[PDB]
Structures are given as C-alpha cells and as structure tokens.
Ligand SMILES: Nc1ncnc2c1ncn2[C@@H]1O[C@H](COP(=O)(O)OP(=O)(O)O)[C@@H](O)[C@H]1O
C-alpha cells in the first residue's frame with residue numbers, strides 16, 4: 001500500500017540528535033528556498049541508517065515521510081529475487097507516487113547475480129534528479145559489509161548511526177510507547193530503565209505489550225466475575241509479571257562490533 005505514515009517524531013524515544021539532523025535535512029529545502037538559491041545548494045536525496053536491530057531505523061524513515069506529508073514505499077531486501085527490472089519498477093512507482101519516501105529495508109541481506117541488482121540500484125539513483133521529490137532511505141544491521149559506492153556523493157549522502165538506547169533514551173522509549181494507555185501511578189519507568197541496560201527499543205516495547213495484555217485479560221475475567229454477584233489501568237504488578245519474559249535480544253559481543261564501527265567514524 002502507498003500512504004502517508006501515522007508515526008511522528010513523538011512516537012520515537014531518544015535520538016534527539018538524529019531527529020533534528022533529519023529535519024534540517026528536510027526543512028532546509030522548504031522553509032528557506034530563498035537561500036536555497038543564494039548559494040546553489042543541491043539538496044539531500046538519501047541517507048543510510050545503521051546500527052543494532054530494533055532501535056528505530058524504520059520508525060525514523062516513516063516519521064520523515066509523516067513530517068513532509070509524503071508517500072511511503074517500503075521494499076525489504078530479500079524479496080528482490082526471481083529480475084533486474086524489479087529495481088526499475090520500484091523507482092518508477094515511487095516517481096509516480098511523489099512526493100514519496102522510498103525505504104530500502106534489510107539490505108545487509110543483499111551485501112551477502114546479486115552483483116548488479118546493486119548496480120541496477122545505483123544507476124537508478126544517479127538518473128533521478130532532486131526535482132522528482134523522491135527521498136531515499138536505507139537501513140542495515142551489518143555496516144561491516146557496505147559497498148561504499150552507495151555513499152558516493154549523489155547517492156546515499158549521509159550515513160547515520162542509530163545506537164542502542166542509553167538509560168535516558170529507555171525512559172523516553174517506555175514513555176512514548178505508553179503515551180495513550182492508562183498506566184497506574186505506582187509505575188516507575190525510570191527504575192524500569194535502570195533495570196534494562198542493553199535492551200533494544202523492540203525489547204522495551206515487548207515488556208509494554210505484555211503488561212498491557214495482562215491488564216486486559218484481568219479486566220476481562222474480573223467483570224466476568226463481577227456479573228455473578230471506571231477505566232482499568234496497567235498496574236505495577238502487570239509489569240512485574242511481564243519481566244519474567246524479558247531479556248536483551250542483542251549480544252554483548254555484537255554491541256562491541258557496532259561501538260567500534262561507529263566510534264571509528266568519530
Ligand atoms: N526509539 C524508539 N522509540 C519507541 N519505540 C521504539 C524505538 N526503537 C524501536 N522501537 C520499537 O521497536 C519496534 C521495531 O523498531 P524498528 O524501527 O523496526 O527497528 P529497526 O528498523 O532498527 O530494525 C518499533 O515498532 C517500536 O515499537
């Protein structure tokens with residue numbers, strides 16, 4: 001389907017740095033085209049996101065399209081196999097859908113025939129002007145195997161690290177996932193962030209979803225009972241019971257690999 005996404009910056013915990021870097025990569029074009037002239041700026045066309053799985057690369061790409069009021073077209077890495085015109089077909093459909101954000105997901109799969117579905121991606125990128133109003137975003141969990149051709153100026157310009165949430169970020173991620181549920185006042189998310197170092201954003205959200213299921217099942221069963229003879233909440237005890245089922249999804253060794261990769265781009 002081709003739509004404008006619902007998710008906004010408000011749904012993304014942490015990443016305040018990356019967020020305002022994305023806006024000026026996006027708001028510069030439009031809120032000052034009367035200095036977008038005066039120096040001859042050839043605007044952005046592509047970013048490559050990287051980092052551990054489940055920290056919000058997809059969220060950020062959707063939320064870029066929500067801020068621009070833009071269409072969102074998402075192709076997942078492996079399904080480009082049968083077969084080069086598939087790459088042409090996708091860019092034409094994202095031209096047709098302008099303004100549009102075209103999101104290449106899971107293309108660490110591609111980085112391993114497949115030789116030139118990369119080449120059929122790169123040339124398609126060079127033969128599409130800034131003026132077609134199509135913004136490209138890519139995401140990988142394997143920054144070690146990025147062919148730097150796709151970062152040559154003209155393609156995926158900016159390379160943005162998306163890290164595991166530190167302690168502050170994890171309070172933001174819990175707070176955001178919960179921004180519209182009724183949660184009891186005995187619930188301490190700052191202490192829950194303290195107890196979840198190394199948890200991904202996905203990891204965090206799962207705890208929330210389990211605490212929500214159990215508050216739901218308890219509400220079902222109780223007023224099943226209270227019919228034999230007032231909005232319910234998610235209490236602290238729904239959260240205690242959600243954590244039996246909770247541990248980090250990303251390994252400490254892998255953490256190190258990302259930390260080293262990013263910290264050597266300063
Ligand atoms: N910064 C964040 N704030 C809130 N939720 C997050 C965040 N990062 C990840 N999540 C949760 O984890 C899920 C998966 O995130 P996603 O953006 O698909 O990760 P990635 O693209 O890095 O693999 C999201 O639907 C969201 O609920």
Ligand SMILES: CN1CCN(C(=O)Nc2ccc(F)cc2)CC1
Pocket residue numbers: 141142143144254255256257258259261
């Ligand atoms: C299928 N496996 C998966 C893990 N893996 C790897 O290399 N991970 C990695 C993590 C972080 C980083 F920065 C680089 C690599 C080997 C192949």
Ligand code: NA
Pocket residue numbers: 051052053054057140141
């Ligand atoms: Na990922």
